[PDB]
C-alpha cells in the first residue's frame, strides 16, 4: 500500500525459516511428495515469490518503494542448507553474523568480508562512499595479514602499520545496541580512524574515545555535521575543521 501510494516501506520477516517449517507441515500432511530436508519442491517458489514483491517504482507508477529485510537462521554455520541456499539465491545481498565474532568483541557480529550488497555503492551518500571505500580497502588488506598479528614480532614497517590500522577500524565498527547513528555522525567517526588519528591511541580505548568524541561533535559542532550532510561529501573547509577538532580533543583525551 505504501510502495504503491508514493510512500516508502521497510518489511522485516522474522524469520522465513519458521514460515518454511510451517509450510512443510502442511505440505507433508497433505501427502505432497517430500524432498530435500522434507520440504516440498515449491518451497523456493514460496519465498522467491514473496521477496520479489519488494521493488523500487519509477515516477510514472508513483515513485514508491518497498525494502525487504528477511531473516534466515542457519544451523551451526550451514549457509548451504536448503532454505539458506534458497533465500541467499533470491536476495540482492546478505549480512552474515558469526558466533566467534560475537564473543571476541565484534558486536554487531557482522562478517564484513563475506557480507555483500550487489546494489552497493549506488545507494550510499557521496560522503559515506568516500570514507567507506578507503575503509573497505584498508580492512581487506588487513584481513590478509591478520593471522600473523599474534605470531609476529619481526614484522617489517609496511605490515605493522596495516595491522594497527586494521584493529583500529575494526574497533570503529563496533557499536552498542539500541543506538543508531545519523549518516554524518557515522562518517565523522570513520573519518578519525581512516585518516589515522587513532593510530597511536591504544586499541582498548577506541570505544571510550568514539563515545566522547561523538558526544562532543554533537554538542558543539552541529554546523560541521550539517555541512558533511548537505555539502554532499567532505569539503576542503570540512577537512580543515575535522583536522583541528580531532587533534586538540585527542591531546585532551590522553591527559
Amino acid at each position: 500500500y505504501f510502495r504503491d501510494n508514493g510512500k516508502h516501506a521497510l518489511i522485516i520477516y522474522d524469520d522465513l525459516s519458521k514460515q518454511a517449517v510451517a509450510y512443510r507441515q502442511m505440505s507433508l500432511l497433505l501427502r505432497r511428495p517430500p524432498g530435500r530436508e522434507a520440504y516440498p519442491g515449491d518451497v523456493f517458489y514460496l519465498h522467491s515469490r514473496l521477496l520479489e514483491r519488494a521493488a523500487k517504482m519509477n515516477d510514472a507508477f508513483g515513485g514508491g518503494s518497498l525494502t525487504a529485510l528477511p531473516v534466515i537462521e542457519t544451523q551451526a554455520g550451514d549457509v548451504s542448507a536448503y532454505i539458506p541456499t534458497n533465500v541467499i539465491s533470491i536476495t540482492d545481498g546478505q549480512i552474515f553474523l558469526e558466533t566467534e565474532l560475537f564473543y571476541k568483541g565484534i558486536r554487531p557480529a557482522i562478517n564484513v568480508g563475506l557480507s555483500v550488497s550487489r546494489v552497493g555503492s549506488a545507494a550510499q551518500t557521496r560522503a559515506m562512499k568516500q570514507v567507506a571505500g578507503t575503509m573497505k580497502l584498508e580492512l581487506a588488506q588487513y584481513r590478509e595479514v591478520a593471522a600473523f598479528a599474534q605470531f609476529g614480532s619481526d614484522l617489517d614497517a609496511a605490515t605493522q602499520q596495516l595491522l594497527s590500522r586494521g584493529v583500529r577500524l575494526t574497533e570503529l565498527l563496533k557499536q552498542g545496541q539500541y543506538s543508531p547513528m545519523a549518516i554524518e555522525e557515522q562518517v565523522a567517526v570513520i573519518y578519525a580512524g581512516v585518516r589515522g588519528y587513532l593510530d597511536k591511541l591504544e586499541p582498548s580505548k577506541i570505544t571510550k574515545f568514539e563515545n566522547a568524541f561523538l558526544s562532543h561533535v554533537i554538542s558543539q559542532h552541529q554546523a560541521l555535521l550539517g555541512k558533511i550532510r548537505t555539502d554532499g561529501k567532505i569539503s576542503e573547509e570540512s577537512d580543515a575543521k575535522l583536522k583541528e577538532i580531532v587533534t586538540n580533543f585527542l591531546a585532551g583525551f590522553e591527559a
Binding site: Q25, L28, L29, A38, Q75, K104
Partner: protein, 318 residues
C-alpha cells in the same frame, strides 16, 4: 546424554525452591523412575513435602521412561495444568520444573507413523514445531500471576542442531548449554560459557560492572579457543607475551567456572558451595586484572568464592 541436566535442576531446586515463598510443581516427563523416588524422599526429609500436616509446597507429576508414548506425550500437559491453576486461581509465585521436555517431542514422534503421517526431517513428526507451540506457550507468566519455569532439554546424538532442541531455543528467556567436551575434562557444571545466553545480559538491567566482567570472560575464553589448535602443534613458547598471558588467565577462568554442588557430593567428594552474585563478579574481575597470575591453575579447580582458591594454592605448598 549424561552431561549434567538433572544434577543442575536438582541443585536449582536446592538453591531456589527451598527458599521460595510459594508453590512449586515438579513434572517427571519420560525420565528415570529411580530419580523420582530419590526426589520424593529428599523432599520429605527436607520438609518441602510433609505427609503429616498440610504445609506442603511441591506438587509432583510423573510419567517416566517405563510408560507407553501416549502417557509420555501427555504428562507434561498434566504438570503445567497443576502449574496453571496456581498461577490463576491462586495468583501466587509458581516455580515449574520439567525434566525432561524433550520426551514430549520424542513421544509424539514414537506414534507418528502409526498415525499415518510422512516423517519430516530426522525422523520427526511434521507437527513438531506446532505441537511444541501449543504446549510451551501455556508455560508462561501472565498478568494474573507468575511462573518461573526450568526445563531440562535432552539433545539427541549430542547435536544442538537437531530439530527438537533447535526448535526449543525460541521458547526461552535464558539458556544454559551443557557440553560433553567440557564434562570429560572434569569441569562441572559443564556449562559452555560461549553458548549460554540470557535475555537480561544487558548493562541497562544488570549494571555495567556485571556486563563488562561477563563479556571480558567470554572474550578471553574465545581468544584461548582460537589459539587452542594452533599452539598444540607450533608449541607454547612461540606465543607473544600478550597471548601466553591470556592462555594462563583463560585456563584459570575455565577452572573458576567449575563449582562443587550440594547435590553432587556423592560424585565430587567435595562439600557443596554456593557463591553469591557480588562475590562472583569481583572474583572473576580479579583473575582478569592479573591479580592471580602467580597462582597455579589447579587452585581454581572445584572451589567456591575466590578466597577459597587462594586457600587451596596455600595448601598446595605442601
Amino acid at each position: 546424554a549424561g552431561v549434567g541436566k538433572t544434577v543442575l535442576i536438582m541443585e536449582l531446586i536446592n538453591n531456589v525452591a527451598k527458599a521460595h515463598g510459594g508453590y512449586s510443581v515438579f513434572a517427571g516427563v519420560g525420565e528415570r523412575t529411580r530419580e523420582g523416588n530419590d526426589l520424593y524422599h529428599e523432599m520429605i526429609e527436607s520438609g518441602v513435602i510433609n505427609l503429616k500436616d498440610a504445609t506442603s509446597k511441591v506438587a509432583l507429576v510423573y510419567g517416566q521412561m517405563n510408560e507407553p508414548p501416549g502417557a509420555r506425550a501427555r504428562v507434561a500437559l498434566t504438570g503445567l495444568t497443576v502449574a496453571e491453576y496456581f498461577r490463576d486461581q491462586e495468583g501466587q509465585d509458581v516455580l515449574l520444573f520439567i525434566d525432561n521436555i524433550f520426551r514430549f517431542t520424542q513421544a509424539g514422534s514414537e506414534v507418528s507413523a502409526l498415525l499415518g503421517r510422512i516423517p519430516s526431517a530426522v525422523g520427526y513428526q511434521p507437527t513438531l514445531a506446532t505441537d511444541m507451540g501449543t504446549m510451551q506457550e501455556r508455560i508462561t507468566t501472565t498478568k494474573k500471576g507468575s511462573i518461573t519455569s526450568v526445563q531440562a532439554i535432552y539433545v539427541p546424538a549430542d547435536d544442538l542442531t537437531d530439530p527438537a532442541p533447535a526448535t526449543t531455543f525460541a521458547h526461552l528467556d535464558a539458556t544454559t548449554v551443557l557440553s560433553r567436551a567440557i564434562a570429560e575434562l572434569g569441569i562441572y557444571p559443564a556449562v559452555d560459557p560461549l553458548d549460554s545466553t540470557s535475555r537480561i545480559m544487558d548493562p541497562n538491567i544488570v549494571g555495567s560492572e556485571h556486563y563488562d566482567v561477563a563479556r571480558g570472560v567470554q572474550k578471553i575464553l574465545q581468544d584461548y579457543k582460537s589459539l587452542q589448535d594452533i599452539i598444540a602443534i607450533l608449541g607454547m613458547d612461540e606465543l607473544s607475551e600478550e597471548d601466553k598471558l591470556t592462555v594462563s588467565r583463560a585456563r584459570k577462568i575455565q577452572r573458576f567456572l567449575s563449582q562443587p554442588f550440594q547435590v553432587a557430593e556423592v560424585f565430587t567428594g567435595h562439600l557443596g558451595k554456593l557463591v553469591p552474585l557480588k562475590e562472583t563478579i569481583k572474583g572473576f574481575q580479579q583473575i582478569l586484572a592479573g591479580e592471580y597470575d602467580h597462582l597455579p591453575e589447579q587452585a581454581f579447580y572445584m572451589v567456591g568464592p575466590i578466597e577459597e582458591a587462594v586457600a587451596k594454592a596455600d595448601k598446595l605448598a605442601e
